[PDB]
Enzyme design. Structure first.
Site, PDB file in Angstrom:
ATOM      1  N   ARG A   1      57.420  33.069  61.042  1.00 37.32           N
ATOM      2  CA  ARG A   1      56.929  34.316  60.451  1.00 37.32           C
ATOM      3  C   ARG A   1      56.014  34.112  59.246  1.00 37.32           C
ATOM      4  O   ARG A   1      54.950  34.706  59.182  1.00 37.32           O
ATOM      5  CB  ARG A   1      58.104  35.203  60.036  1.00 37.32           C
TER       6      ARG A   1
ATOM      7  N   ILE B   1      66.981  35.801  67.101  1.00 36.30           N
ATOM      8  CA  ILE B   1      67.828  34.869  67.828  1.00 36.30           C
ATOM      9  C   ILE B   1      68.835  35.720  68.594  1.00 36.30           C
ATOM     10  O   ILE B   1      69.448  36.627  68.025  1.00 36.30           O
ATOM     11  CB  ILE B   1      68.619  33.966  66.878  1.00 36.30           C
TER      12      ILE B   1
ATOM     13  N   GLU C   1      62.045  32.624  60.462  1.00 37.91           N
ATOM     14  CA  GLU C   1      61.383  33.026  59.222  1.00 37.91           C
ATOM     15  C   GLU C   1      60.233  32.064  58.888  1.00 37.91           C
ATOM     16  O   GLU C   1      59.227  32.465  58.293  1.00 37.91           O
ATOM     17  CB  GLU C   1      62.399  33.089  58.074  1.00 37.91           C
TER      18      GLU C   1
HETATM   19  O1  LIG Z   1      68.377  40.882  59.561  1.00 43.09           O
HETATM   20  C1  LIG Z   1      67.401  39.859  59.902  1.00 43.09           C
HETATM   21  C2  LIG Z   1      67.822  39.280  61.245  1.00 43.09           C
HETATM   22  O2  LIG Z   1      67.415  40.277  62.168  1.00 43.09           O
HETATM   23  C3  LIG Z   1      68.396  40.361  63.243  1.00 43.09           C
HETATM   24  O3  LIG Z   1      68.317  41.666  63.919  1.00 43.09           O
HETATM   25  C4  LIG Z   1      68.850  42.884  63.297  1.00 43.09           C
HETATM   26  C5  LIG Z   1      67.829  43.848  62.566  1.00 43.09           C
HETATM   27  O4  LIG Z   1      67.361  43.371  61.272  1.00 43.09           O
HETATM   28  C6  LIG Z   1      68.301  45.339  62.429  1.00 43.09           C
HETATM   29  O5  LIG Z   1      67.122  46.190  62.419  1.00 43.09           O
HETATM   30  C7  LIG Z   1      69.377  45.816  63.472  1.00 43.09           C
HETATM   31  O6  LIG Z   1      70.026  47.059  63.121  1.00 43.09           O
HETATM   32  O7  LIG Z   1      70.341  44.768  63.755  1.00 43.09           O
HETATM   33  C8  LIG Z   1      69.579  43.707  64.387  1.00 43.09           C
HETATM   34  C9  LIG Z   1      70.387  42.858  65.358  1.00 43.09           C
HETATM   35  O8  LIG Z   1      71.498  43.666  65.752  1.00 43.09           O
HETATM   36  C10 LIG Z   1      68.204  39.079  64.165  1.00 43.09           C
HETATM   37  O9  LIG Z   1      69.131  38.983  65.353  1.00 43.09           O
HETATM   38  C11 LIG Z   1      67.939  37.760  63.290  1.00 43.09           C
HETATM   39  O10 LIG Z   1      67.402  36.613  64.176  1.00 43.09           O
HETATM   40  C12 LIG Z   1      67.299  37.977  61.822  1.00 43.09           C
HETATM   41  O11 LIG Z   1      65.860  38.060  61.630  1.00 43.09           O
END
Ligand SMILES: OC[C@H]1O[C@@H](O[C@H]2[C@H](O)[C@@H](O)[C@H](O)O[C@@H]2CO)[C@H](O)[C@@H](O)[C@H]1O
Ligand SMILES: *[C@@H]1O[C@H](CO)[C@@H](OC2O[C@H](CO)[C@@H](O)[C@H](O)[C@H]2NC(C)=O)[C@H](O)[C@H]1NC(C)=O
Length: 246
Positions: free
Chosen positions: A163, A71, A160
């Site tokens: 997913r 997102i 999720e």
């Molecule tokens: O943490 C689950 C979350 O993912 C976000 O993105 C993160 C990611 O997990 C990480 O690798 C990184 O260092 O930071 C990311 C964003 O800055 C998503 O934005 C969210 O939708 C969830 O799935």
């Protein structure tokens, strides 16, 4: 675009929306029959817009990165909100440009930054369709603290759920009553990246994982996933994170 309305929503329409959500993401290859998310997409096409309506009919539009299903931000009436992360800032150059003002949250979209902002882990935050109605409602009016928690509800209900079929199933059981996520749910969320990697690595390792994944199952027991014949790979995971992004 994809849409979902909570007014009149039941396990059926929810599943259909999640089915749509999945079908909206492009891919050119399937790995072991599972859509493989693109390494990257250039421009505005990199983002999918989800129109969500709460029970009263109010709506927010959420922009999703079709390469990872992250997102980026959303539009609430005439104000746009984006996480504080490079990707979202990039995303703001393309979506909701006509919003009257743009607010950057005070945190990224990472589960850990979100739980801090929220003051509690996902573990203790009830989810389900009712909870998703609350979330939409919260985000209509800016509150960074209430938003962190609504955002944790939103991520799980929608990204999720696309997913993993199991998580989609978890939410349909919670169509009329929220409930904290089972640990198998948190386990799957935490493991999407690794599972996506090992599914792709198995491809020239005869379906064997180079490195086994440790999960927590339905019954709450620790289990190892070593190859593609596991139900997790045969039934559960529905979208794969391209290793070019891992
Ligand atoms: O943490 C689950 C979350 O993912 C976000 O993105 C993160 C990611 O997990 C990480 O690798 C990184 O260092 O930071 C990311 C964003 O800055 C998503 O934005 C969210 O939708 C969830 O799935
Ligand atoms: C790949 O994964 C299979 C299960 O997901 C696994 O099969 C089993 O492992 C032992 C049998 O020697 C049992 O603990 C288990 O019941 C078996 N599962 C089933 C359904 O038969 C394979 O052995 C794994 N293969 C590799 C290469 O590790």
């Amino acid at each position: 675009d994809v849409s979902f309305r909570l007014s009149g929503a039941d396990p059926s329409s929810y599943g259909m929306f999640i089915k749509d959500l999945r079908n909206a993401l492009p891919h050119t290859e399937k790995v072991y029959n599972i859509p493989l998310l693109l390494p990257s997409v250039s421009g505005a096409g990199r983002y999918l817009l989800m129109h969500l309506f709460n029970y009263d009919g109010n709506t927010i539009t959420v922009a999703v990165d079709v390469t990872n299903v992250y997102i980026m931000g959303y539009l609430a009436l005439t104000t746009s909100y984006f996480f504080n992360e490079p990707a979202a800032d990039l995303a703001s150059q393309y979506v909701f440009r006509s919003a009257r003002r743009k607010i950057t949250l005070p945190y990224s979209g990472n589960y850990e930054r979100l739980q801090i902002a929220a003051g509690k882990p996902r573990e203790k935050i009830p989810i389900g369709l009712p909870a998703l109605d609350t979330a939409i409602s919260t985000l209509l009016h800016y509150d960074s603290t209430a938003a962190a928690g609504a955002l944790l509800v939103l991520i799980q209900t929608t990204a999720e759920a696309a997913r993993f079929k199991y998580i989609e199933q978890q939410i349909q059981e919670r169509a009329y009553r929220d409930e904290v996520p089972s640990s198998a749910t948190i386990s799957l969320e935490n493991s999407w990246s690794g599972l996506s990697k090992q599914i792709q690595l198995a491809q020239g390792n005869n379906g064997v994982f180079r490195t086994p994944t440790v999960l927590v199952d339905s019954k709450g027991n620790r289990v190892q996933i070593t190859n593609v014949t596991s139900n997790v790979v045969t039934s559960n995971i529905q979208l794969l994170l391209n290793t070019k992004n891992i």
